[PDB]
Amino acid sequence: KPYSSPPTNLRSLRDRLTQVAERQGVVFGRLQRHVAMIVVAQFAATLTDDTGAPLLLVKGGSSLELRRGIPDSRTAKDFDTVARRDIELIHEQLADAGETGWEGFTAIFTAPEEIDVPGMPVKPRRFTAKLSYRGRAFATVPIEVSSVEAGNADQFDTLTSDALGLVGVPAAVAVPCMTIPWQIAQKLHAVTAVLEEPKVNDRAHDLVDLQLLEGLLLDADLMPTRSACIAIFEARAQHPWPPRVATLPHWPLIYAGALEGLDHLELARTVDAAAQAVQRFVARIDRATK
Ligand SMILES: [Ca+2]
Ligand SMILES: [Ca+2]
Ligand SMILES: [Ca+2]
Ligand SMILES: [Ca+2]
Ligand SMILES: [Ca+2]
Ligand SMILES: [Ca+2]
Ligand SMILES: [Mg+2]
Ligand SMILES: [Mg+2]
Ligand SMILES: [Mg+2]
Ligand SMILES: [Mg+2]
Ligand SMILES: [Mg+2]
Ligand SMILES: [Mg+2]
Ligand SMILES: [Mg+2]
Ligand SMILES: [Mg+2]
Ligand SMILES: [Mg+2]
């Protein structure tokens, strides 16, 4: 019943994914996207400095999916990371990792393209990973790499998934991820940000993620989060801490879309209630003391 040998080719891989997807009540395309993300995360995990510490930390929706699993996180598309040092050399190192491969997977990476974010000195970069399993194309993963901000790469959590073990690839998965205090700080900044006039803030989905991250902190002391928040809002030098969690007129349906598949969770069911919940969390963070 549990595959003893790894898949022999892509067809057997997809074949096995579809069976695991139905087996645990998940959409096939999501499980396959999840596996593609894990493969690229394992490439990233081979990148270390000369003391063995990670060079790349995962963040964004990929990290939330690793923390909570597929059923309890939003479906997200990209592989967002923070580069611990020198961003230009990350691409070359990933390309080498993908050429060497991991458990039969290989990757070719497209050229990095800068993107403008006013609050960051060094601009993030975006590119794509073209994944193949035993020579035959498998999936495509959008990748975003941003430079370190304050102490958001000082520490990392190490997360796992058994998805590849379920289709017969047993090699252990261990993914360094940006810690929750810094995820909260950056999402709070993004969801409360006022963009330059032409652009508009669409990030109502961050209201879902912030509720999920708050729940993941359980009873933890909020002082690390408060410090991280203060550090991000000051480094970025835009709107100050603590922010106001305002809702824009087009967010009701964007927030509703972000709830898709999460009916079983205890979440705010309207954007107003979501804004009120995240505003309470902001105040709870601000009250923390050493
Ligand atoms: Ca994040
Ligand atoms: Ca994902
Ligand atoms: Ca810091
Ligand atoms: Ca909590
Ligand atoms: Ca106001
Ligand atoms: Ca609505
Ligand atoms: Mg599951
Ligand atoms: Mg290590
Ligand atoms: Mg994602
Ligand atoms: Mg830690
Ligand atoms: Mg940690
Ligand atoms: Mg799984
Ligand atoms: Mg827009
Ligand atoms: Mg629905
Ligand atoms: Mg409920």
Author numbering: 3 to 292
Please give me the paper's original passages concerning this structure.
We found that while Rv1045 encodes the guanylyltransferase TglT (unusual type guanylyltransferase-like toxin), which arrests bacterial growth, Rv1044 encodes the atypical protein kinase TakA (unusual type of atypical kinase antitoxin), which neutralizes the activity of TglT via phosphorylation. It encompasses an N-terminal domain (NTD) and a C-terminal domain (CTD). The NTD (1-181aa) exhibits an α/β fold that commonly found in nucleotidyltransferase-like proteins. A large central cavity is formed between NTD and CTD.
